[PDB]
Structures are given as C-alpha cells and as structure tokens.
Design a protein that fits this description.
The structure is cut from a larger assembly and holds 1 copy of chain A (101 residues), 2 copies of chain B (100 residues) and 3 copies of chain C (552 residues).
Chain A lengths: L5 E2 L4 E3 L6 E8 L5 E4 L11 E2 L8 E3 L6 E4 L4 E8 L5 E2 L8 E2 L1
Antiparallel strand pairs in A: 3-5, 3-8, 4-7, 6-8, 9-10
Chain B lengths: L4 H21 L6 H18 L3 H7 L13 H4 L2 E8 L2 E8 L4
Antiparallel strand pairs in B: 1-2
Helix pairs in contact in B: 1-2
Chain C lengths: L1 E3 H8 L6 E3 L6 E3 L2 E2 L32 E10 L2 E10 L2 E6 L1 E2 L9 E2 L5 E4 L4 E4 L1 E7 L5 H8 L1 E7 L5 H5 L5 H11 L6 E7 L5 H10 L3 E5 L6 H14 L2 E5 L9 H8 L4 E3 L22 E6 L9 H9 L2 H4 L2 H13 L4 E3 L11 H16 L11 H8 L4 H6 L17 E4 L10 E4 L2 E7 L13 E4 L5 H7 L1 E4 L1 H6 L1 H5 L4 E4 L20 E3 L6 E3 L2 E2 L18
Parallel strand pairs in C: 4-6, 5-10, 5-11, 8-9, 12-13, 13-14, 14-15, 15-16, 16-17, 17-18, 18-19, 24-25
Antiparallel strand pairs in C: 2-3, 5-6, 6-7, 11-20, 20-21, 21-22, 22-23, 26-27, 27-28
Helix pairs in contact in C: 4-5, 5-6, 6-7, 10-11, 11-12
The complex binds nickel (II) ion (6 copies).
Chain lengths: 101, 100, 552, 552, 552, 100
C-alpha cells in the first residue's frame, strides 16, 4: 500500500492532433545559451537563432505544454512546429505582429 | 535570550523530535510527522556542530531506514528541508529520499 | 508529438481512466472525464504556458478570472473530472479549459494580467465541508475545523456555559446579537441556532427576528410534544430549519409520539443513531420518514474496538443510550443512503476536526465489509465516493437552506475550496480557500529561502485577516432579521446571506442519500432490522487516516 | 420528602451553616443565608428543572434574564450568601430565586427561552478584581490579569519606554489618544492616568480634557510641593483622582511637608509602606489621615523569608527604602483596616497576576499569627474575608470614582464576575465573565469529544473577540473628555463610562478598611508603633496558594 | 566640575572621538559630533534631570515633543552623531539638545508634561529598514521583518499561491483591493506591486488605478521586450516604479536586447547578480547604466563556503544561473557602490529577517578582504558604515518614491526608528518604534516584578494593536488610486501616503552608491571584469552575527 | 509535518510532563499540574503503543501513588481525561481516581 498512489493505465497521449506542423533547422549563432518554451511565438525568438523566420510565422514548438528546447552556443538542430489556434492573433513577444496572423 | 519568531518556531521542531526520538527508542516504527521531525532536528544539530551543507545532505539519508518506519511513509517523504545557523550564517539543507 | 501516460500524469496529473488511491484507504477513484485539449494544458513557471501573449491574454480584468486552479482533479457529488477552475469576484466562475483565446483552442476560462494562479496538477479539489452541529463552546473550534477542510459552521452557543456544553443553543436576542458580532472575527461562514424549547411562539419569533437561521429543540430544555409543535409552527412561517434532539427518557412519550407531534413537517434529526441523544433505544427509526433529514455525529463513526468502552464516561441508563446494535447498524445505513449527513457535535460528544476524516473511514470500512455498491459501474469506488462526499457538503447545505451560496463546486457559488494531495486526502489539506482567498495552509519556516523548510504547520493567511476576512466570509441570517436591518443595527462587517428553502427539503432531496428503509428496532434486543433482515457490521481494530498522519 | 445535608451539598452546593475552606489556606467561610426554597432549586440538564413549562417559563426576552448563574455561593463585602444570580443587558439584574412563576414559588429571577445557564452549584462567585496601579509596559498584562480574576485595570504607560518602566504615566494628549484607541483591543475595563508633575495647571487640564481619569505624581518626574499642589488643584476642579509616589530622597522636604502641600485634599497614596517609593523611612504614617486613601503594591505582601533578599536588585540608599520594620508592619495594618487597597505595580516592582492571590496570603498569615478579628462572630473567618475582598474590589472602585459601574455584585452594576472552584479560590478561576459574556476560561483539547480532556489551559472566549469585546468592556473617561466628544473624535468602539466622586471619598468611605491609627515611625530604628505599641509580625517560610498549584 | 571620559561614556554613552565596535564584526564607528552642552545632558530617573522645573518645563503639549530619545548615538547616511531625538505627531521633530529653556542652555527640543522618555544612552539609533522585494506568501513575514529592524515592506502576492511563490505580483483589481484591506492588520508600512506582464496598457492602468505603487515584470509571466516596453510606458505616465526579473532563458533576446527594450527609462533591477533570476550569465552588467537602480537579494550575501552547494535545490541549466564568478564579484560591487540596495526576496530565494544582518556581514567581509575604502578619513569605518546603511534605508525609499515619508532620520519624516544595543547591532533590536509608538520589543516574564526576567523574546506592543496600529502605519497608494478614492471605497483605516518621483531617480541619486562601472562578463568563463581588472573575492568559512546570537 | 492545532497543543502537554518527569526523578512530591501532566502524557504513549482504552483506564491509576504527591493533590484530581490517536482513530480515556 502506498498513500495516494496512482494507477495510470499504460499507453500514450497524442498531442495537438488535427493541426498544421512544419519542421525547421535552427542554429544558435550567439555565444550564450537560448531556451525556448512550448507556446512562444517561434518567429519572434532571440535574433541569434538562425532559421527561416518566415516559415515559423504563427507557429510554436510542437512539444508538451510547459516544456522547452535548449540551444547551446553553436548548436544546430531540427525542431517541429505546430500552428497557433484560437483567433490566431499574436500580441507581445518582440512586438513584430501585434494583431491577427 | 531575545528570541525571534524563527527561534521559537524551531523549539516546536526540536520538541516534536524529542517525541519521535523516544518512540523510536521503544522500538516503534515511526509515522510520517515523527520521521520528518527526527531527521530535521538531526540536521539542525549538524549545523550547530559546524558540519557543511554538503555533508548533511548525505548524512541525513542515514538517520532512518525503511524498516524503522510505517508502510507508505518513505514514499510520503520525497525530501526533507530545514534551515539552521551554520558558522557562516543560515543555510538550507535539502535531503533527497532520506528514508530507504 | 506524443507522450506516454505515466510521464503525462507526472506533469499534468492523471487523466481519463487513471485511478488514484484516496490517502491510505482502499477507496480508488477513476477520472471520468478531462475537459482539456491535449497539448494545450496551462502550466505556470519559468518558460511555461502562462506568459503574456501565450497562455495569458490581453483582456481587461472584467474579461478574465481573478484566480485559476490549473489541472485540478475535482471530486464532487456530480462527478470526478479533470479540469481548470476559474474564480471571479469570490465565486466559482467556471469549470473548463483555461487559457488565452488568441492562440489557444476551446478556452472557456480567460487568463489575463489580473489572474493569479494556483497549480493544482496532481491535486484533488473539493468544496469546503459544512458542519451543522456546532456547539459554540470556544472560538478556537473555527481554526481546528478550517484546517480539516470545513468552511461553514452552523450551530449555537455562548461559550463554555452549561447551556452550551449540553445544547447547540444561543438563547435569546442579546446573546444572539453578541454572537453575530463575534462571528466577523472567525474565518468560516456562520449561521446560528436559537433555543427552540418554548410553548409561546412569540418567544421564538423574537429569536428568529434577532438573527438565528434555525432552532434547536433539546431534551435538556424539554423536548415535549408541545414545545416541538410550537417550534415547527414558527419554522413553517419564518422559513428557518429545526434540529432535534428528542426525549431520551421517553418521559412525554415514545418515539412514535414525537413523530406524531412533528406531524409530517420538515425536521433535521441530530445524531439519529441515539448515542448522542434521543428516544431510547429506537430514535434511529426516524430515517424511514420522508420529512426527516437524518444526520450522525462523529464519535460513533465508524464502529471500532474501543467505541463502546469510551462512550460511557463521555455520556456523563447509559446502557439504554449506548447500544452496540444501533452503533454497528449506523455504518451500514450510511452506506445504503438512509443517513444523509455527518456532523461533529463539537465538544459535546463530537470531535470538531474529524467530520471529513471519519466519513471516509466509514466508506472504507464499508467497502471492506460489504464490497461494491449496487450502483457502481467500472472497477472503482466512484459512486461510493460521491455518496459520502455529499454527506458533509451539499446535503447539509440543502437541509439548512444555504445551498444557494455554498455546498459544492458549481458556478455562482461562493469559492470555498479545499486542495488536497492524494496522500493526505481527508486528513491534512494543502490549501483552504475562502471566498476566493487562501485563509489557512501549511507553512514552513517564515525566515526560510522557500516556504517548504521545517517546521511546517498550519498558519492563518491573508484571507483570515481583518477586512479581507470580512469580505471572504458570510454570516447567514433569517429572512426576517435581514429585513429588520439586524446587519446594519449590529454593524456587522461581513457579507450577509439569507437562508431559504428550509421547509421544502425532504428526504428525496438528499443527494445520493434518499433511501427511506422499512426499519425496525427490537425493544428488548435492540437489534436493527430493515425489511426483516438484520443490519449489523463488525468493529475495526485499525483504521486508515489515523496513526500514519498524527504526532499524537 | 427529606434529604441529608451531605447529599444536599453535593447536589446544590453548601447551605446555611456549612463551612468551606478557601483553597489550601486556613480561612473558612460559613454560608450566612440561602435565598432558595428547599425543593425548588433550579438545575440544568437532562431531566432537570430548567425545561419548558417547568423551571423555564413562557415570558418574552424582555421579561426574563439573559443569563442565570444557578446555586452560587456569593462572597462579597456585604455578605456570604447562597443564591441564583440574574444578568440582563450585561448588568447584574438580581440576586435571589430563579425559576418560573407559573409553577414555582418565590421566583424573583424569571428564566425563559432567552435565558442561558451557568451551573454554579459547588462554586464561589465574586466581583471581578480592580487593579489601580498598572504600568502599561506591554499589552500582554491584560490577559495575565484577566486570568487571575481582575477585570478592571487603571494605570498609565505607553509601552516599554523608560518613562513607563518607572511611572504609571501616559504623557500628554497624543499618547493618551493613542492608548485610548489601543484599549478597545484589550478584554478589561481601562482608565488612564496622565503625568501630573507640572507647575502649570493648563498642561494638566489638557491631559484630563484628552481622556485621563486621574493624574500620577511621581518622584522621577519631580514630586515637589509645587507640582503636588498644582495637580490637586486641577483634580479638585475636574473631578479626577490623584495617585502619589512621594519624594523618597526627602529632597524638597520630609513627609510632613508633602502632607502639608496636599492640604487635606483627597489623594490616593501608592505603595504606602515605602518599598515601592516614598519618603524614607516614614511615608507609611500617611494612613493616619482622613483624606489619604492608602494602598499597597504586591511584592511585599506578605512578609516572607526571601522578601528582603530579593528587594535590593529589584530596586535597581536601598537600606533607607527596603525596611524589614515597615514591611513586617504592613501585613498587620492590612489586618487592622489601616491599609485599604492592594494593587500590583505591574512590572515596576509588582506582579500583575498576583494581586488577589497575595491578598489572601496576607489574610491567611494574619489569621495564623493574630487569630480571629475582634469583629468575628461565629466560628468562621467571614468578617476577615469581607475585609480583604473589599481591598481589590469595592475600595479601588470608590477611590477612583468608578464604583457606580463596577466593584461588587450589586444590581445595576456591570456583570464582571468570576466563578471559582473552592479548591482553587484566588488562584485559578473556572470562568471569567465580562459584561455578561465569558471572556476567558480554562479549556481542554479543542478537538476533543468534551471540553475537559488535557491539556487544559486558559484560552480567550467569545467575550474577548472583535465587536463582542467592545460591547462587554468599558473605557473610562473624565467628565471633560466625555463632553468634548473624545470618544467620537478618536472613534472609540467600546462602551464609555465617566468617573465621578473622586474628590469626596475619604478614609471613612473605605468598606471595612477605615481605620486611622495614631501611627509613628522611629527615625533611627524604623520601628512602626500605633499608640506606642510596636506593630510587627514574623516572615513565612511556606505559603498557601503557591507550590501546590503552579508548574513553575 | 570634571569627569573622566570612561565614566562619562558609562553614564551618557560615548562622545566625540570614542569608537564603538558593531556587534562582533571588525567594523568600528567613531562619534563624529556631539550636540550636547557638557553638564546639561538630560537623564531620566529618581533624582535625575527630567523633573518639573528642572529638565522638564512648563510649556503646553503644543510647545513640546511627545517623545524624546535621550543621548542617542545616531548612525545614518548623513552622519554618526550623538544627540537627543525629538518626536512630535508621529514624526521626527528635531535632532539636537533636549531639555527646559527656563534653566538650561541651547535647548532645541522642549520637554514638558506631555513628554514621554526613552533612555537611549549607550544605544545606537537608526531609521527603520525598507525591504522592496517582498513576496506576500504569508502574513507572518511582517512580524519576522519588524523584529529584525525593517519597518516598510514593498512587494506583491496573494498568499501561498503558485503565482506569488514565484513572482512579487498581486494580480488585478480584486486581489489588489483584498490585499490593501488585509494590510491594515500588519504593523509595517506597505506598498503593493501588480503584475506588469501584459502588452495591453489598459490592463496595467487598471491595476495602478486600483492601488499598486509599482509593477513587477517577471520572466514566469513573460519578460518579453513587448511586455517590458508596455509596463515602462504606463510607469512613465502614472509615476509608479517598475521592478524587473529578466529573461534568464535568453528566449526573446540577450541582455543587450532587454536593455534596448528598456530604452533608457527608469527601472529597478531585482537580484542584479543573476542567481535569483535574469539573463544568464550577464544580467549583472546592468549596474553600468544610469537609468538602472540595482539591488541584491540576500541569500548570496555574502559569499561563503556553503553558498553554492545550497543554491541548486533552492532553485528548484542551474549552472547557467548559479555562478561562483558572479556571486564572488557581487560582494565587491557592493563595497564599491555599484550595487545600491539590498532586499530579501522573502520565501522565494530570500530570508525575510536577514536583510540588515547580511548587509553588515558583507561590509565586514569586505573590510577584512579589501581594507579601508578610499573615502575613509580617520581610523574608523564610518564611511563604509554610511555606504552600507544607505542600502536598506534611503536608497530603497528613493527607488520607489517614498523617501518623502520614510527612509532616514531627518525632520518631518515618519518616526520609524530602531534602538540597538552595540553588542546586538544588526541582529536583535532593543526597541522598534513605528510612527512614534513602540510596536515590538523584547519582553521578559509578563507576571514579573520587572520587565527583564526570563524568558525574554519579542512580543507585540501597543503600537501593533487595533486603531493605534492604524494610526502608526502607512499604506502607500499610487497618485491615481489616491485620487479615485480607493482608500474611502475600500474603507482603509490606516494613514495614506502617495508615491511620487519614481521616474526621475537615476543611479546618480543613490546615496553613497552611485558608481557606474565599465563592467563586462565573459560569456564562457563567467568572469566579471571592471576596466579589464578581474573582480572577485574569497568565501567565508565563519561569519559574525551568526552562531553567537541564535538558538537554532 | 503539517501539524494541526491539536498536535501543537499536545506538544504543550508532552513538555509539561518532561518537567514533572524530571522532578519526580529528583525525589520530589509532585504538585497538581505536574501530576495531571505526567499521567496524561503516559496515556498518550499507551495509545501510540496500541493499548486499548479499557487497559489504559486501569494502568493510568498506577502511575503515581499518594506518597509521591503533595498533600491535597489526590483530592484535587477526581479523574484525568485525555485523547490520542489509537490504531482505530482518536479515543477518549478517562482515568477515575488515578492517585491513591
Ligand atoms: Ni444532542
Ligand atoms: Ni450537540
Ligand atoms: Ni511608585
Ligand atoms: Ni508603580
Ligand atoms: Ni526574481
Ligand atoms: Ni522575488
């Protein structure tokens, strides 16, 4: 017996189903580490990360909510993005869109 | 003594441990609060002795074993945290998985 | 992407199909539904979802909630579901999917700059308990009860006076006024009961007009047919509830006489089993009637090895009152739904901080002795959990006419919530929220770098302070007092609530506990039978939610 | 029927002719009268008398009391009698026979639905003590004092400031206003004393107009003839009392000079023996005068083996102040009635929770050393008990002009009462009632099934909470402040009372303590003589009301 | 006559030229001036100076102070001088020579009948500390802080909620209102910070209009350039301050980006070293800018042997945040004046009762490691003492626009003072005064004959009670809230103060801490360099103000 | 430990008993509070051990005799009551005429 123990049934959960995705190669050209969160507007991340910003418009990382991906200096890797839903209106971040799209 | 609120609060922890310390001596398997109180009071004394935070993080995992506590207890205590005045001021000691 | 079920549970708490053990009992609950969109769950912290432009939106305070409890596993009489809870203006705004409509789908609970966050993932959230059998012997009882998960206390008293030690009665206008004023200092919702033992209606109307939301008829003041009839007549016209502790001595008549005096009118019977008081030895038969709303006090719950032994000196003819036959049966009657409420009977044959704890101990002992309820579906105790939680939340609220304000997690109700870690469910809460503000919670070293270092023990929070308390608690008044301007006259500082619907509730209205058994008690043997079959159970030698959690 | 005297005492407490030992002292009291009708005594409980139609009647709240203390054995300056006490509207309604006029005879205290009950059978009931020598060094003193049986505290201070450590003075309008506001938070009646040491009348009138009910003249601020005269002139015109701590150093003159400066005007002399302050070594001679109302502080009461030893460091020339000759005599002077009041001198050479305790210890030591008082009638210490109880109740109330509100158990006075079990009389109260509500009492385990399980220790009750407290306590003001609207201006929440009759009280007015002895002190030997006979006594090695009752 | 210097110091405290060791540190202060006239010093007690006609005069309350702290040794940013302090109407009246103009010379502080006295001879008096990094996780923090010598607390929170555990934010109108009401119950001056992370200005204006005096931008809610710009725009128009905890993850940009977003506008940077949060690993470079007001949280102060070890689990990438190189440098930067404030970060990586204590520990460790400051004159550490005391008093007050009310011992400022015995300086205060009334102090046995017997521990005084508290504390509001009538609307009982001058303070305005070093951090090695020279220091194995004073 | 008000209150009882326990050891005759504290703390331990209410009601009368306490004390204590967590939950133990 273990107080308050879970009995999680085996298997997996498919995340963000039914939504547009795209893969992008990203490279950190800065001399300091950069870590991006699951729901951050990818097209507006730190300017030192080199990639196709145009393709990443209206997209965020296709990873479980609240987690992040880190890029050490000089690191290059391929990430998968999932498109924003809701009203598809971006406000904040680097202040590049500030409205729908 | 000009005791501050934190000093008086710690007298509560010290006392809870005297209770647990006696019961352990009788040969009883400690419950949840008793276990937390015993390991915690042990750490506060380690600091009074001048032991480093690093040493206490390790020693704290050898105060009680799984056979000295009630069932389920070890799982109820993923870690134990307590602060005390070390020679170099107040420091925090976290003991991870103290009971095994 | 994809994520395994185990890791998912570790990060956001359990989802549909997962089971969770309640504390160290044998009761398991299974998530019946999840109101989230996988991938869009909200989480707080560095790099998480609840950040500007992301999970947090641009709406003004009026268009978002003040508080959001994320990833909560709700256990209420209506369901055991996974969802975010939104609280706005001190009340339950919604149960659904929290987030930002700008970039997230299915958002029903908007999070903005004016939103505070309580991470509830891995935690069970319930309505605050409601104890309707309080003896106001001392004010310290409110803290004890609040810490246990009880947020509303109804009862009567003036302090450590002989009258109050024995009965839940606040006698007359002066004491009633005094106690209504003292109540603003206590961090729980409060309603008062006056002395109902009089054969002059005007003496009762005065008390109601002064502020009581009910009347307690107690044998110590004379539970005679005349006094009973008088109290019920006033209750009928003033929409207040009556609580009864009948004539144990059978001095004015037997149980059938009291029942006749009641005349089919609504009445809340206290400690219906009898140990706490009532017609010896068959007051328990009252639970068969449609107008009787039956409750138990907690010392007899559940039947254990030391129960009978401790009950004699606690009484201080005892043998006519303390019966093993009725005590053993009471547990079963609760499992069956014949007894609808649990209460304490604080310091007058009851333990104030053990209402919730003991209710779960009964459920556990009944699962072990009787197995699954006929109503169970699936391999879980979901229905038995809903039947028992209703006993100290929605049912007490309905019996006393306050269900419109408190009693459950439904929209528009006061946000009186309790957060529990599954390992301590029913024993020691993680957070107790009153009217939308945390009022008490476990707190470690005040001078520490984090709130977790020892010693951790319950301490009053901002919701229990001065005017913030007044804004987060309710003082219940009878409709009459409310109209007569009692609140303004006594200059009460807390929010006011009026009771209504006390004369129309009947046994059929008790959530999941509406059984009216054809129950009989043997005058000689004291055996309890339902439809001729003997009702009984065995006493426990060891119980869960006990020695593993307490220092003493 | 008939009933034996022993069983009767066990059931209703002692009656006429029965004797009861006071705690563990040698003092015995004997019931002088019983106001009941044998067979008609009221008792509460299951099957008892106080039930509807029986001992409880049908009258409305206006026609019955709010509280009744049943079968109480009253010990007051006017008598030691057995009776029921009725309390209505926070005040003493009557002392007589409680019950229902419908079926009972000789009922003078009607019990109805609006009546609460405190079972006082087997208990001694007294008025709450009144300490007129408080140094407001910290607010915690109010709880300590309340627990000991003291309900009214008069004195001065601003907290732990050098001025307050030494003198009972609240200096000026600002601090006075601040302390009047802080007083609503304390569960005792309070009156404040300002600094009377000034030779400019207007500087004194301001303080009175601000709220003080008296003025303290203290040598630390300069107890000069000029300052003394100035304070007494203002007192005479503003009807406030003056308390004096004279010039110990004899710097401005000897005792006869101070007495001359006083000029036959009314004055309360603090610690008249001298140890606590005053003309060395003969300030004690003041008790011979008709205008002097003499009181003692408690550390010198009674003369014991460790008294002299502890007094030097507590002082911190000492030999001129701490005199065995005057300390030994003081006990006798109290027994004779030359010293009329006892007080503490809280944390400035006095123990706040030991006023009552030490007064009884003196009475005991005097009975043992001197035997019965010439006034005794019967084989009991009734008169000596009345003489001593008057010292910390009615006399202090008369000296400071508040006897119209508090000070004794008489009709119309505020219901400040203390219930004592005979075994703990003067040591640890069973219940302390303020303005008709219990404010503090011993309370066992809050979560227990009854209020008696350990640990039992004093805890604040409803009468000490928020607005209920404000309604059950009094803040005394000078007539001037009252008229100037100070209460409304500072927005005081408590009930207000005005002092009056401070200039007309004289030694002859002190209940049972009005002796004006022809006392002389030898300048060289320090010996105290009355009519030439040496006054003295022996020091105790062991005292009652001490090691048998305290944990430390 | 004449008197030797040693005896003089024993009687009136030290004078010009005397040195006093601060607690058990190596820091020595030397009296720079004495405002007395030798022979005319005022002293209280039997036979002393402060007596009618002598040191006390005949003036009315309006012409004399309410309180006088005699013979105090003041240590403030402007000087270390010996003088009497006069307090009138809850504010600092004057610093000079107290007494009676009638017979004494050079009297600038008139003592009359309305004057209370605090003997400060042999004691050090300072302004009350000001902590601007409070996480309102629990109300108990106010007592802990008050006891340590901190009288003003600025920060945000709603209690033990995930949002508050991580950020100093009181989210939205409802919680802000609730917390403003709860604040009247706390014995410290309070100002609240709202959540500044939004890209919609109106959502920020609402919070300011509701009552916050500042906005906290925290990475957990999203410290993006857009959110930062939005908060600073509102701050500029509403005269409120912004506190920043930048993007540690460098997710939206590196440090230079955040700095660019700030655009030269005023901003208070929290825990500028980085351990507590901020652009890894170079957020420390912010202290080079003229618009940045830099502060440190206390767990990294000072660099000791166990510092690094304890920081990982307290965090709960850690290596990017917890850097030995920046932690070692921080101590030096404080010694040089590049870091201008110290704060706690209560229960979110900071110890509430250790702000003052740790600041002195840094000064000590720097004296030992680096020797005298270039600014020192004489053989004392006077200048280093002024530089460090300014860090938790005047500078925090200037940064948040409250320097017009509190922050130092200057005339017209609220009388928030702390009395210290030299042996316990910075560790345990002798008296903590709020608005002219003692609010907390060490207090011995309540029932004792004097206030000194054991056990002595800190207990709340009259200045911390009900309405007296309301009169001695301030609740700070934004100019907008003040005008909108928030105080009247929420019915706040405490005195109100408005913040102003938050947009005009710059690094040059920080008293004795205005250095803008040409600082650089090596991206790889993390080494901190100023003008190319490496900044670093060694970790302490033992510190003063630690094991010699605490029971645990 | 998440101590509730009742647990902290009981630390007061436990501590009062340590005081009495030491004094008894010195050979002193216990006074009223010391006696109540000693017998009470003994009962709480009986419950922690798992002894029944019935057994404790009897054993409690054998902790102190009339020769181990001050005069008058036995009469001042007609009974002693205390509650503790037994294996089957909280129960009340009343010890009648504990000192003889
Ligand atoms: Ni009952
Ligand atoms: Ni009851
Ligand atoms: Ni005196
Ligand atoms: Ni005095
Ligand atoms: Ni931070
Ligand atoms: Ni912080």
């Amino acid at each position: 017996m273990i107080p308050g123990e879970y009995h999680v049934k085996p298997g997996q959960i498919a995340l963000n189903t039914g939504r547009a995705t795209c893969r992008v190669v990203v490279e950190n050209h800065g001399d300091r580490p950069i870590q991006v969160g699951s729901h951050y507007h990818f097209a507006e991340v730190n300017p030192a990360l080199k990639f196709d910003r145009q393709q990443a418009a209206g997209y965020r990382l296709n990873i479980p909510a609240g987690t992040a991906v880190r890029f050490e200096p000089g690191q290059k890797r391929e990430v998968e993005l999932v498109a924003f839903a809701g009203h598809r209106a971006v406000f904040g971040f680097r202040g590049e869109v500030m409205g729908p799209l | 003594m000009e005791l501050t609120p934190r000093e008086k609060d710690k007298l509560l922890l010290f006392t809870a441990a005297l209770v647990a310390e006696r019961r352990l001596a009788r040969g009883l398997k400690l419950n949840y609060p008793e276990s937390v109180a015993l390991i915690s009071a042990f750490i506060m004394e380690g600091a009074r002795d001048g032991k480093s935070v690093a040493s206490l993080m390790e020693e704290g995992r050898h105060v009680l074993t799984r056979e000295q506590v009630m069932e389920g207890v070890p799982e109820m205590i993923p870690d134990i945290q307590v602060e005390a005045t070390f020679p170099d001021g107040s420091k925090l000691v976290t003991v991870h998985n103290p009971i095994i | 992407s994809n994520i395994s079920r185990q890791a998912y549970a570790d990060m956001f708490g359990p989802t549909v199909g997962d089971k969770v053990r309640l504390a160290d009992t044998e009761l398991w609950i299974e998530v019946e539904d999840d109101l989230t969109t996988y991938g869009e769950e909200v989480k707080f912290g560095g790099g998480k979802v609840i950040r500007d432009g992301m999970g947090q939106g641009q709406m003004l305070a009026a268009d978002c909630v003040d508080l959001v409890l994320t990833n909560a596993l709700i256990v209420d009489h209506w369901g055991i579901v996974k969802a975010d809870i939104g609280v706005k203006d001190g009340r339950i705004f919604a149960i659904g999917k929290a987030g930002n409509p700008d970039i997230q789908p299915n958002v029903t609970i908007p999070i903005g700059a004016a939103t505070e966050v309580i991470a509830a993932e891995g935690k069970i959230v319930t309505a605050g308990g409601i104890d309707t059998h309080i003896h106001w012997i001392c004010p310290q009882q409110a803290e004890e009860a609040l810490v246990s998960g009880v947020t509303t206390m109804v009862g009567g008293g003036t302090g450590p006076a002989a009258g109050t030690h024995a009965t839940t009665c606040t006698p007359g206008p002066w004491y009633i006024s005094r106690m209504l004023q003292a109540a603003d200092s206590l961090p729980v919702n409060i309603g008062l009961l006056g002395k109902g033992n009089v054969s002059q209606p005007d003496a009762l109307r005065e008390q109601v007009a002064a502020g009581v939301i009910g009347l307690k008829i107690h044998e110590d003041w004379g539970a005679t047919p005349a006094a009973i009839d008088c109290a019920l007549t006033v209750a009928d016209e003033m929409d207040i509830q009556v609580a009864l502790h009948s004539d144990t001595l059978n001095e004015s008549g037997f149980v059938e006489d009291t029942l006749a005096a009641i005349g089919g009118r609504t009445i809340h019977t206290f400690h219906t089993e009898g140990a706490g008081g009532g017609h010896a030895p068959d007051i328990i038969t009252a639970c068969a009637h449609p107008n009787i709303l039956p409750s138990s006090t907690n010392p007899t719950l559940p039947y254990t090895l030391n129960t009978i032994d401790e009950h004699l000196d606690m009484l201080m003819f005892a043998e006519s009152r303390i019966r093993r036959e009725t005590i053993a049966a009471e547990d079963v009657l609760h499992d069956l739904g014949a007894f609808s409420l649990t209460s304490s009977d604080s310091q007058a044959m009851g333990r104030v901080g053990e209402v919730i704890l003991r209710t779960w101990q009964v459920a556990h002992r009944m699962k072990v002795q009787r197995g699954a309820l006929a109503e169970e579906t699936g391999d879980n105790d979901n229905f038995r959990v809903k039947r028992y939680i209703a006993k100290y939340t929605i049912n007490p609220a309905l019996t006393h006419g306050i269900a419109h304000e408190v009693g459950s997690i439904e929209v528009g109700k006061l946000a009186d919530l309790v957060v529990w870690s599954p390992a301590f469910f029913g024993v020691k809460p993680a957070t107790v929220i009153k009217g939308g503000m945390i009022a008490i919670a476990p707190m470690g070293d005040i001078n520490a770098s984090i709130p977790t270092p020892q010693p951790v023990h319950y301490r009053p929070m901002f919701g229990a302070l001065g005017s913030a308390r007044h804004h987060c608690r309710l003082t219940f008044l009878s409709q009459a007092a409310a109209a007569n301007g009692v609140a303004e006259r006594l200059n009460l500082r807390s929010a006011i609530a009026v009771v209504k619907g006390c004369r129309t509730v009947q046994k059929a209205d008790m959530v999941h506990n509406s059984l009216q058994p054809n129950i009989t008690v043997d005058a000689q043997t004291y055996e309890v039978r339902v439809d001729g079959e003997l009702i009984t159970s065995e006493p426990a030698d060891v119980l869960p939610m006990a020695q593993r959690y307490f220092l003493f």
